[PDB]
Design a protein around this ligand. Structure first.
Ligand SMILES: Nc1ncnc2c1ncn2[C@@H]1O[C@H](CSCC[C@H](N)C(=O)O)[C@@H](O)[C@H]1O
Ligand SMILES: Nc1ncnc2c1ncn2[C@@H]1O[C@H](CSCC[C@H](N)C(=O)O)[C@@H](O)[C@H]1O
Lengths: 318, 318
């Protein structure tokens, strides 16, 4: 009874989604028990329908039942606060943008053309779409901020940023990485390069409106590519790394912060197929990072894991 | 952890769907191993794109890896044969029809109107849409054939069908229920009533083009409603039962075979949400079946669970 459960497990995602999307989850903070009848009235939902949804959520262990009402389980508490990796994943991923594409994914395999499953559906690139769909961009940036904040602590321990002067984050969106590093390391020129509609404003953090497919600005002694190359096939990844080498002098260092694919890595493997669907891209093994680095004329000096799924790679021009 | 795994678990569904939809799963019969680079070459898929998909399928436990290729695990062997409950569930459920409806479900809750989440997406009713998409109706009927075959053995043991001469199955798709009884109980007039484009063909089985919302044909001593009523709200459900009672005489019997609304079953709980999403309908307690049957002018004589999920109801006229 494993296979049928794997196939129908999507309904649990969908049930969690409707509970978040209808704005009900916000009422379940501090494991507080809430009355289904009063919740139905607040949002003008048929109690009968809302009680049946809650019964399904009880069976999948999301909600717990009492004579006081229903509350979120200890394991599913994070549905309460909007700024959790769980809540923001529901907002970012559970929508037509991904689910229309997942349905088109089997066609993108059979029709081997330059179009990703997403491109076939939307008729644009994923990042071209985010320019239009503003709500999804803010959700994307919010989810990416959480994955940045898991890393800052071990990143600041493992790598020495204090030795550098000028730092450039290639594709750093809202400069969360650099904002968080600037918090624990002062006396540094922090700059973020990314394709912006409106350039983000800060103090101490510089924001360039550029493109890493065009020659990258010189002067920087530290370049960073955090969760970028996994959005680009080998030929496009090489293009980005070639421009990095050209922009780098002898002493300059390139930091790759990525989800490292390992023979045992479910979390990284599920995201691998997601990157294929969206960008026709992938997560890469250590050997695959060297392959694209060697073709760009860069050499791997250091590689170390930051946590269970994230890793760091130091590349220098040699 | 629980919550995030539940949210992202839909990617496992999508992975299995893609593996089936593209038509690869057929090459894994009798749990026999297979080369990826070979598979990729046959259908014209980029080795990388498919090998990465198969890498993820190994992690979730659907495939097993080895030096000489990949195979379907013992637990996921059912993906191989086309007529399996798991395969037919993938073909039927994992498509735009359900997935777009799931994404609309939280809108249908807030918009407290008669229109189901399906109607809000498709504009038509579920069965109105199936009369246009012939391929989905074939997949739907094929899946309902499997859920019939689970019940036959115990249904024949629990109900004596040899005491009946003329038998009408109201909404019996391809008459699997009557085909499977016609094998075990012989010399009977087996007629199946349902909305059809092309009338199904089977030895010793008649097939009427009919609507149970219109007057039902008299002169049958057994009428059957298997997995019909739970597709209809109370008012539509009572109309069907009213037509049944009016069609029945004093000696006639009505069988209802249905998923009873059980308090503890996760399988039954998820299907209830599915009935709301597709039909604006619900599963009913034994007391709620009495209510609608009472209003229709029918009495309950026999109720019995055929297994953990399905149950039978004998109704008579008075
Ligand atoms: N051609 C291009 N030039 C520059 N940045 C680009 C780009 N195409 C995509 N990007 C940016 O690449 C980023 C990928 S997501 C990574 C964001 C950030 N480094 C983090 O890890 O949190 C996005 O911010 C996107 O805007
Ligand atoms: N108005 C209507 N009149 C008659 N049959 C209808 C109908 N609307 C739907 N149906 C039929 O009702 C069935 C519900 S699904 C159940 C099929 C079958 N009893 C089984 O268990 O295998 C479908 O076959 C559908 O075609």
């Amino acid at each position: 009874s494993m296979l049928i459960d794997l196939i129908t497990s999507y309904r649990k995602t969908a049930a969690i989604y409707t509970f978040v999307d209808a704005g009900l989850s916000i009422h379940f903070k501090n494991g507080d028990y809430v009355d289904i009848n009063k919740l139905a009235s607040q949002y003008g939902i048929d109690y009968s329908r809302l009680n049946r949804l809650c019964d399904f959520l009880i069976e999948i262990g999301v909600l717990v039942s009492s004579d006081h009402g229903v509350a979120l389980s200890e394991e599913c508490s994070a549905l309460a606060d909007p700024n959790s990796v769980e809540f923001l994943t529901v907002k970012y991923e559970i929508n037509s943008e991904h689910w229309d594409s997942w349905l088109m994914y089997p066609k993108s395999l059979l029709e081997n053309n330059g179009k990703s499953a997403f491109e076939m559906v939307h008729g644009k690139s994923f990042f071209e779409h985010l320019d239009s769909n503003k709500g999804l961009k803010s959700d994307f940036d919010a989810l990416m901020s959480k994955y940045t904040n898991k890393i800052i602590k071990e990143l600041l321990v493992i790598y020495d940023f204090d030795k550098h002067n000028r730092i450039l984050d290639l594709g750093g969106g809202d400069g969360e990485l650099l904002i968080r590093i600037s918090e624990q390391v002062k006396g540094k020129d922090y700059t973020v390069l990314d394709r912006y509609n409106e350039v983000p404003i800060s103090e101490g953090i510089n924001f360039i409106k550029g493109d890493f497919f065009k020659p990258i600005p010189t002067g920087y002694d530290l370049y960073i590519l955090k969760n970028v190359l996994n959005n680009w096939p080998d030929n496009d990844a090489i293009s980005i790394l070639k421009n990095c080498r050209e922009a780098m002098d002898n002493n300059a260092t390139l930091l790759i912060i990525t989800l490292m694919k390992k023979p045992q890595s479910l979390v990284v493997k599920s995201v691998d197929i997601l990157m294929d669907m969206l960008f026709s891209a992938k997560q890469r093994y250590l050997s695959e990072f060297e392959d694209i680095a060697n073709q760009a004329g860069l050499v791997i000096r250091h590689y170390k894991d930051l946590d269970e799924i994230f890793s760091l790679i130091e590349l220098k021009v040699k």
